[PDB]
Scaffold this active site. Structure first.
Site, mmCIF file in Angstrom:
data_model
loop_
_atom_site.group_PDB
_atom_site.id
_atom_site.type_symbol
_atom_site.label_atom_id
_atom_site.label_comp_id
_atom_site.label_asym_id
_atom_site.label_seq_id
_atom_site.Cartn_x
_atom_site.Cartn_y
_atom_site.Cartn_z
ATOM 1 N N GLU A 232 0.799 -1.221 0.000
ATOM 2 C CA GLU A 232 0.000 0.000 0.000
ATOM 3 C C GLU A 232 0.831 1.271 0.000
ATOM 4 O OE1 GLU A 232 -3.141 0.178 -0.457
ATOM 5 O OE2 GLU A 232 -3.835 -1.844 -0.019
ATOM 6 N N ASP B 70 -6.207 6.316 -4.949
ATOM 7 C CA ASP B 70 -5.737 4.940 -5.020
ATOM 8 C C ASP B 70 -5.782 4.449 -6.464
ATOM 9 O OD1 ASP B 70 -8.373 4.144 -5.546
ATOM 10 O OD2 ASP B 70 -8.647 3.146 -3.636
ATOM 11 N N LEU C 194 -8.747 4.010 2.643
ATOM 12 C CA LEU C 194 -9.757 4.579 1.760
ATOM 13 C C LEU C 194 -10.634 5.547 2.542
ATOM 14 C CD1 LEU C 194 -11.337 4.581 -0.904
ATOM 15 C CD2 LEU C 194 -12.592 2.577 -0.054
ATOM 16 N N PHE D 223 -8.403 -6.465 2.843
ATOM 17 C CA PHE D 223 -8.013 -5.070 3.010
ATOM 18 C C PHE D 223 -8.159 -4.306 1.697
ATOM 19 C CE2 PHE D 223 -5.437 -2.112 5.652
ATOM 20 C CZ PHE D 223 -5.053 -1.200 4.695
ATOM 21 N N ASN E 257 -6.436 -20.310 -10.136
ATOM 22 C CA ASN E 257 -7.816 -19.843 -10.155
ATOM 23 C C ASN E 257 -7.917 -18.386 -9.705
ATOM 24 O OD1 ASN E 257 -10.809 -19.957 -8.609
ATOM 25 N ND2 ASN E 257 -10.667 -21.021 -10.580
HETATM 26 NA NA NA Z 1 -4.533 2.151 6.697
HETATM 27 NA NA NA Z 2 -4.555 7.094 -8.985
#
Ligand code: NA
Ligand code: NA
Ligand SMILES: [Cl-]
Ligand SMILES: [Cl-]
Ligand code: NA
Ligand code: NA
Length: 163
Positions: free
Chosen positions: A11, A20, A32, A104, A132
């Site tokens: 992240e 993001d 977020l 997450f 898969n």
């Molecule tokens: Na966070």
């Molecule tokens: Na972006």
């Protein structure tokens, strides 16, 4: 390596509001804020989350606090979900982190709908599950991250997070 270090790699860390990979306002370690296109809406979410008037900027400690909360919330979402809990409970510690990482990123509901991948994971058919899992929007849109998470499910090691 652990779930915190793993998600910090996947992240990043940014102290000002950013978009993001899906275009949504975010801050910190992938926290977020909102799916609304309004930056003002995102700023309200941020001030509420931090408990002060932030002006769109937070400290590292504040980012890490949101991250503590967000990892916890991913685990609680797994444990409350009838599709995800049996899979989580069947997995070892390293593969549990891979499942937390997915939740997450994409949320409980999305991951919980992958009935074939989940079955293969619960059956411990690791190479089959890995193939898969790659048949997904997730893999196509974030392939380097998905490859790391999938390698973690395939091997039960942290090898994809070394170097
Ligand atoms: Na966070
Ligand atoms: Na972006
Ligand atoms: Cl609000
Ligand atoms: Cl990626
Ligand atoms: Na199979
Ligand atoms: Na297999």
């Amino acid at each position: 390596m652990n779930i915190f270090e793993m998600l910090r790699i996947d992240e990043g860390l940014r102290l000002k509001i950013y978009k993001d990979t899906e275009g949504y306002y975010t801050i910190g370690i992938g926290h977020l804020l909102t799916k609304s296109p309004s930056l003002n809406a995102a700023k309200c979410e941020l001030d509420k989350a931090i408990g002060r008037n932030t002006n769109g900027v937070i400290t590292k400690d504040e980012a890490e606090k949101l991250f503590c909360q967000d990892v916890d919330a991913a685990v609680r979402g797994i444990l409350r979900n009838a599709k995800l809990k049996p899979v989580y409970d069947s997995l070892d510690c390293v593969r549990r982190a891979a499942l937390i990482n997915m939740v997450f990123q994409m949320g409980e509901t999305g991951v919980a709908g992958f009935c074939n991948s989940l079955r293969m994971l619960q059956q411990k058919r690791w190479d089959e599950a890995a193939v898969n899992l790659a048949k997904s929007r997730w893999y196509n849109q974030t392939p380097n991250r998905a490859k790391r998470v999938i390698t973690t499910f395939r091997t039960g090691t942290w090898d994809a997070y070394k170097n």
